[PDB]
Design a protein around this ligand. Structure first.
Ligand SMILES: NS(=O)(=O)c1c(C(F)(F)F)ccc(-c2ccc(C3CCNCC3)cc2)c1-c1nnn[nH]1
Ligand SMILES: [Zn+2]
Ligand SMILES: [Zn+2]
Length: 231
């Protein structure tokens, strides 16, 4: 009931929301094709450091995110992972890299970001090119579920907290439309959701790329949203 909504966050401000011990989401807003949308990422405590998942969608938002983390948490962000190549995930990577954060993404995401003219994470994450692949990265597991919202989309699990961050492959419960599907695989998306459901059956919190966290029901809801879009 306290998660911040789009009309509560002016463009350029970032909120943090405590999900579990050592796990936060970050929430920002951005204008795109003349409409404002909220967007989520993740922060995970990594001893006396933090791991960031996704930018706050833009250079100014990402600078505000680092300032909010400094104020609220006070531990340095040392690494960041972007979960796909679009601007709500990589826009702000240059700000992170100037702030000394080591930025990472799969080779699939890096090639697509490059081709798109988007910012490119520095380092390549091998071991994620096949659907069902999983790799450990600090306090999280990165999982490639297969093509869904994009061909390169990753999801992130925090085993200590049973938190699943789905990024843009997972929609919030109130969603009635599939968002930007220009780079999506609408036929594979339900199968990729099924793989996530099978691999993370103990997830307690599921965080979508945009909107409110909930439970495991966000996964089936997302498959349903995608099916309604398809027909
Ligand atoms: N990642 S993206 O590329 O495709 C994207 C961008 C971007 F800036 F980054 F260019 C801008 C806006 C959106 C966007 C995000 C959410 C919605 C809908 C909002 C109401 N409930 C159903 C979903 C519509 C659009 C999206 C997006 N994310 N997930 N689905 N679409
Ligand atoms: Zn996207
Ligand atoms: Zn998105």
């Amino acid at each position: 009931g306290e998660y911040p909504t789009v009309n509560e966050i002016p463009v350029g401000e970032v909120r943090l929301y405590q999900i579990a011990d050592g796990v936060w989401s970050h929430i920002a807003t951005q204008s795109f094709d003349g409409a404002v949308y909220p967007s989520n990422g993740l922060i995970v405590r990594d001893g006396d450091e933090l791991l960031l998942i996704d930018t706050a969608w833009g250079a100014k938002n990402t600078a505000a995110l680092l300032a909010e983390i400094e104020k609220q948490i006070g531990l340095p962000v040392t690494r960041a992972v972007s979960t796909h190549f679009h601007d709500d995930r990589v826009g702000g990577v240059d700000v992170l890299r100037a702030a000394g954060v080591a930025t990472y993404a799969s080779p699939s995401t890096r090639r697509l970001a490059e081709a798109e003219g988007n910012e490119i994470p520095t380092h390549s994450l091998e071991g994620l090119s096949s659907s069902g692949d999983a790799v450990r990265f600090g306090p999280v597991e990165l999982f490639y579920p297969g093509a869904a919202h994009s061909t390169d989309n990753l999801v992130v699990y925090v085993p200590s907290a049973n938190v699943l961050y789905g990024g843009c492959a997972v929609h919030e419960l109130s969603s009635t439309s599939a968002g930007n599907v220009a780079d999506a695989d609408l036929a594979e998306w339900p199968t990729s959701v099924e793989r996530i459901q099978k691999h993370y059956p103990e997830a307690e919190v599921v965080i979508p790329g945009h909107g409110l966290p909930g439970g495991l029901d966000l996964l089936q809801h997302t498959a349903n949203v995608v099916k309604a879009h398809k027909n």
